[PDB]
Amino acid sequence: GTPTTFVHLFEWNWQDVAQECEQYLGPKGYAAVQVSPPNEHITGSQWWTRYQPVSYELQSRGGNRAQFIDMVNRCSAVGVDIYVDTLINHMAAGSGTGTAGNSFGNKSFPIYSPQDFHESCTINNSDYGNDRYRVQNCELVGLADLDTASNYVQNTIAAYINDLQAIGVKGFRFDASKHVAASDIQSLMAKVNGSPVVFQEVIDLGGEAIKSSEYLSTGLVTEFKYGAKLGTVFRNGSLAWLSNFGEGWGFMPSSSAVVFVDNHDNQRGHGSSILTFEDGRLYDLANVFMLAYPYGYPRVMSSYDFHGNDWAGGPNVPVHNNGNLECFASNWKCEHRWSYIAGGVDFRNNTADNWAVTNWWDNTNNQISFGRGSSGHMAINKEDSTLTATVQTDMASGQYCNVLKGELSADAKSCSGEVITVNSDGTINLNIGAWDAMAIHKNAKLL
Ligand SMILES: [Ca+2]
Ligand SMILES: [Cl-]
Ligand SMILES: [Cl-]
DSSP states (O other): OOOOOEEEETTOOHHHHHHHIIIIIHHHTOOEEEEOOOSOBBOSSSGGGGGSBSOSSSOBTTBOHHHHHHHHHHHHHTTOEEEEEEEOSEEOSSSEEBTTSOEEBTTBOSSOOGGGBOOOOBOOTTHHHHOHHHHHHSBSTTOEEBOTTSHHHHHHHHHHHHHHHHTTOOEEEEETGGGSOHHHHHHHHHTSOSOOEEEEOOOOOSSSSSOGGGGGGGSEEEOHHHHHHHHHHHHHSOGGGGGGOSGGGTOOOGGGEEEOSOOTTGGGTOOTTOOOGGGTHHHHHHHHHHHHSOSSEEEEEEOBOOTTOTTOOOOSSOSEETTEEOBSSSSBOOGGGSHHHHHHHHHHHTSTTOOOOEEEEEOSSSEEEEEBTBTEEEEEEOSSSOBOOEEEOOOOSEEEEOTTTOOBOTTSSOBSSOEEEEOTTSEEEOOBOTTEEEEEETTSBOO
């Protein structure tokens, strides 16, 4: 197979990430980990402190510089890249202290002076619809707005990015990219070595002054329409409608899009329509669709139970806790380990040679099935009945692991879970319980 999917290990520290790469992400074929911001940020326990930078020293809640490097190396040894959440728009609000011991205040930081910032003003709600200048030059919730047109600012951010590349970081999330002119991002990328993966966070559901399409020339772009519409369909619509999901629904080009069911902001209600781990099996099924369907570069969300406090930081117990995995309950949720989601990743990994949707079938409502040509086939039953339709595939006849429920043995003789039969004529006689699914692919076939 080939790498197709990455994961946000939200608020995971560098030792937990490194261990997770070795024990799970490498073996299961995840391509990369998006880590929380690793630069110096304001002190305090809330998750949102990570988005208030104080400097570019690599001392953060996740760990120190040596720990960060050890993580990059341990993950890369098992084939997993690191993408860094990169704060290109701003520095912390107000005054205080950072996680490396530095002080700041009055738009004075270890590496920035007041002249390195746009003149202070406030982004007001109306500005998103009618004032691009203010969205991009004024302050987002009090954060000091860097003058991203300045050569010094561009050189300082680029030096941060290039230091990360020199220690092995392979990609970058440009936080708050809507708040930075795409032209400024273009000037920054000219100072960045090489061609790392770059994706830009731009929330654009339509109807505002700045469009996500403005950022296509400078890197990948978050397609927030994807999760918003997918959530609405899974909650209130029909899965049959998804037969032409993608550009036909008004989305950006597939080859530019980072897609996801939810992210750290919008799982806190910051779309009521967004699906999250709180939705249980409905979330499972949405992720199976996303990962089987050939649109975009998907990012699986990996969350913690925040017990109703949308500002709280993560659990005070590590993920890997002296031999106990603190997953699936009221600490870390570890969605990337949920069987249907990890199985979806394996499916995407092994269908990457055929980015077509073939033999689409539905019952006009909430039962669907489709193929990736002869590389794979899937079905979802999001109804209260058993799905027993006979569907056409392009798969070679034989017996296949349902990779949502099990894995092929090292000897290729058996599956650890359900086995699916492709008939002589390429059909499958489905037998899918209510709110269940199946996926098979050409590299999980019994020999
Ligand atoms: Ca700005
Ligand atoms: Cl450092
Ligand atoms: Cl994002």
